[PDB]
């Protein structure tokens, strides 16, 4: 049982939950690969049985008649059909637990407050589109964002998967350029190229919202345009740098990850988009300042009249701080939910304490929890963490193309 | 079986083939990653043959006259006496390798330039003091810092060891009060308590340089007042915030780690103080702003008239950047070598590239290479890394009590 120290306070805890880690990660006693971004009815029965056990523990009915009856129903369904169906309440519990178990999520204090939309009866790409529009609308809630997930039908033998080809429901186009550069978000070049290939007439601005490419089973993807009035956006200004508005920068309200696989009790849902609300460093530091994204840092630091010829002036650090101030202020001004990296990491420390009492530990990926500016200024930096895989889970999956 | 390692800024891929040599098994398993934790008789001949082979490979002299001969005498030495003495050049070559293998050192671009002071003929805390005093004055060099390591006698069975009871050669005192809390450095409250207990006059200051506690084999320690003209210190001022100097802050010139255990070819040196020069975040962000260190962050924000009532003003981030600006400006004005975190991480990326060609990879600890401020603004944030233990190495060791 790993002992875990907080260095700011001196406290010490042991992670007993890690002992229950189901799947395996990329590290060995030889070598740690923690910093890497990307690390049969009987085994289906085994995962199912474990999840049903989890479910009946949560409702204080472990070992009950209804518990044994459900184990039997699942075994019989897996024997007759090679798969099984989740009850509605098992689905809700399973989606919340997947969030709870996500080691790279700093927002998990909120895990119990999740709106689960059961789209497991979805029939086509066209119905998928309507469900997704309802998700964006409910989650955005006119700027008072609400956490939600929409669960589309599970993977099942004899039929292809539902897939959302887009990595998030709202993303900006990235157009490869005349002179080899990228106009717009360079992270989205490939999906942008796929949209045009599938009939989209491109724009040529830097913040053009992409269409949705939605795949129903055994069907090519289908293009759907998001209704403009469903996509709430925030123009970026700075509270005291008035030329900052003239950069023409914007970002969208809703972060809705749409390319990850939800696993519950051995069942796999390849289409199950989820959304919370932004932490300011995602927009301010990563999306805008990463050299391979919008890469605005030097341009802002010149406008700030910082001395960009020497690194020891800390011009990068000064420009980045003001970009993050601009993001926070603009979202507050527009009345769109946002959390700064200090508030978020402080709430995550409370989550770690809740989870130590409840489950004896908490899976956490230190390199993802610690914000990408002002790391040691936040309490998570001084907190040792144990990273491991629990199920239910959100997993990465390969791109459909 | 050779980890694929990606840089996400550029898209470039390499394979760490050097990882195949990792000896001292780390703390990670396929079940859980512990990469964020701070602290995780003729076996001597095996690590001797291994290290000697390392020596002769490095000079294009494997499988040649001189190579065999040195294999024999270490075998004879350990047969006749149970251990062996290192050749002068091997001690030099081993010191540089243990540096080059330190996964947590961002400074390793400098690893080939190292001055090795051979103190193996030492005996007693009076001799130690002069050797340490030679090191300090040499390494400081009037502020033109030079990397240096002083190797005190190797450990042998049946007789006590050489140890420096201080974690560094220059540390500041930490004094409790009528209420537990500390004037001075809270990281050194313990050794301050030991020094005062061992016959030292406590100061009344937040920046009193502690005395050395030097221990010869099987004998108690002895206190040694460090020659004040040998302890180069830098008063901290800001280039434009005129009141910053009035805060009365200072830091010392020389970072001289004196509690680690140099291990070469199976031999163990529990007293082998090494020293390089500071990266400015070490002082300005960790030493001054950590909540459990000098904890000055809010005092500086009051002085800057920042709104400390809301976390979303990023008042912590702004105060922190200016504290780091003051450190860099102050050391440069005093003409004491120092490197900012942008220049240091840039040079590390160059080191990674060099080590890729030279040895097929480099052991790096992502959580320690990435600076404690502005992490994703430096190139190392976007570089995946493999951590593993190679020998020769610096290792941690328990306090001598
Ligand atoms: C309520 C507010 C929420 C906040 C503030 C938040 C915060 C974050 C942040 C900052 C990241 C790192 C993302 C990145 O750097 O790309 C992250 C990752 C993640 N979050 Fe949360 N999150 C929230 C809600 C949710 C919800 C509702 C779910 C699912 C039900 C979820 C599941 C995940 C997962 C699976 C990841 C890993 C995704 C990846 O590796 O790219 N989060 N979260
Ligand atoms: C010359 C310029 C150097 C720079 C700029 C530099 C920078 C750093 C930094 C910032 C750390 C992190 C330590 C911490 O956060 O407490 C570190 C760790 C370390 N360095 Fe270097 N260093 C230098 C020279 C050296 C030398 C000369 C040696 C040994 C010969 C060395 C070996 C190590 C070791 C063993 C650690 C790990 C210390 C620990 O875990 O407590 N470095 N270095
Ligand atoms: C190489 C490194 O793993 C990579 O840059 C990671 C580091 N930490 C991160 N942390 C978060 N929250 N999001 C990220 O995309 C990353 N990227
Ligand atoms: C908990 C965590 O491992 C701890 O705070 C580490 C993180 N990374 C670090 N990195 C460096 N260079 N120095 C440190 O002291 C630490 N502290
Ligand atoms: Cl995003
Ligand atoms: Cl230090
Ligand atoms: Gd202004
Ligand atoms: Gd411009
Ligand atoms: Gd004033
Ligand atoms: Zn690991």
Residue numbers in the entry:
A (entry chain B): 68 to 106, 119 to 480
B (entry chain A): 67 to 106, 120 to 480
What does the paper behind this entry write?
Nitric oxide (NO) is an important signaling molecule critical in the cardiovascular, neuronal, and immune systems. The enzyme responsible for generating NO is nitric oxide synthase (NOS), a P450-like heme thiolate enzyme that oxidizes l-arginine to NO and L-citrulline. Humans and other mammals express three different NOS isoforms: endothelial NOS (eNOS), neuronal NOS (nNOS), and inducible NOS (iNOS). nNOS is an important therapeutic target since the overproduction of NO by nNOS in the brain is associated with a number of neurodegenerative diseases. Thus, nNOS is an attractive target for therapeutic intervention. In our efforts to develop inhibitors selective for neuronal nitric oxide synthase (nNOS) over endothelial nitric oxide synthase (eNOS), we found that nNOS can undergo conformational changes in response to inhibitor binding that does not readily occur in eNOS. Here, we used a combination of crystallography, mutagenesis, and computational methods to better understand the structural basis for these differences in NOS inhibitor binding.
We asked the questions, how can the inhibitor displace BH4, and does the inhibitor displacing BH4 in hnNOS bind synergistically or independently from the inhibitor bound in the active site? To explore these questions, we “knocked out” the active site inhibitor binding by mutating the active site Glu to Gln in both hnNOS and heNOS to generate hnNOS E597Q and heNOS E361Q. 4 binds in neither the active site nor the BH4 site in these hnNOS and heNOS mutants. This result indicates that the binding of two inhibitor molecules is synergistic and that one molecule must first bind in the active site before a second molecule binds in the BH4 pocket. In this study, we also found that the binding of a second inhibitor molecule in the BH4 pocket first requires the binding of the inhibitor to the active site.
